[PDB]
Amino acid sequence: GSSGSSGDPGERLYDLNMPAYVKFNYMAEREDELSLIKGTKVIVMEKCSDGWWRGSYNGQVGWFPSNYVTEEGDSPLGDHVGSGPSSG
């Protein structure tokens, strides 16, 4: 008894909102791509298994190479984090 919706390997991960750190300034050319800056922080929203990531920078949004950024991560000071990973 199950619901066969995605009969394929892997999964689509989006709306993550994971804070990343631009280790290398990326130069975008297409409106779809985003220009990253070494020494800043972005917010990853989507992730393409291939390797390309999709986040925001200063209100902007586009595609950028994850190899340039790094998952900095930030924990909520005070009470242990909770909202996010939902499982049973």
Swiss-Prot record:
State the source organism's domain of life: Eukaryota
- Which of the residues bear the PTM Phosphotyrosine? Y14
Signal peptide bounds: none
Location of Phosphoserine modifications: S75
Membrane-crossing ranges are none
Query: Subcellular localization, per the record?
Result: Cytoplasm; Endoplasmic reticulum; Nucleus
Q: List each copy of the SH3 domain by range.
A: 15-74
| Modified how | Phosphorylated on Ser and Tyr residues. Phosphorylated in response to activation of EGFR and FcERI. Phosphorylated by activated PDGFRB.
Q: What does this protein do?
A: Adapter protein which associates with tyrosine-phosphorylated growth factor receptors, such as KDR and PDGFRB, or their cellular substrates. Maintains low levels of EIF2S1 phosphorylation by promoting its dephosphorylation by PP1. Plays a role in the DNA damage response, not in the detection of the damage by ATM/ATR, but for efficient activation of downstream effectors, such as that of CHEK2. Plays a role in ELK1-dependent transcriptional activation in response to activated Ras signaling. Modulates the activation of EIF2AK2/PKR by dsRNA.
Write out the domain note: Only the first and third SH3 domains seem to be involved in RASA1-binding; the second SH3 domain and the SH2 domains do not seem to be involved.
Self-association state and partner proteins as the record states: Interacts (via SH2 domain and SH3 domain 2) with EGFR. Interacts with PAK1 and SOS1. Interacts (via SH3 domains) with PKN2. Associates with BLNK, PLCG1, VAV1 and NCK1 in a B-cell antigen receptor-dependent fashion. Interacts with SOCS7. This interaction is required for nuclear import. Part of a complex containing PPP1R15B, PP1 and NCK1. Interacts with RALGPS1. Interacts with CAV2 (tyrosine phosphorylated form). Interacts with ADAM15. Interacts with FASLG. Directly interacts with RASA1. Interacts with isoform 4 of MINK1. Interacts with FLT1 (tyrosine phosphorylated).
| Designated name of the protein | SH2/SH3 adapter protein NCK1
Q: Which organism is it from?
A: Homo sapiens
Upper lineage: Eukaryota, Metazoa, Chordata, Craniata, Vertebrata
Range covered out of full length? 99 to 173 of 377
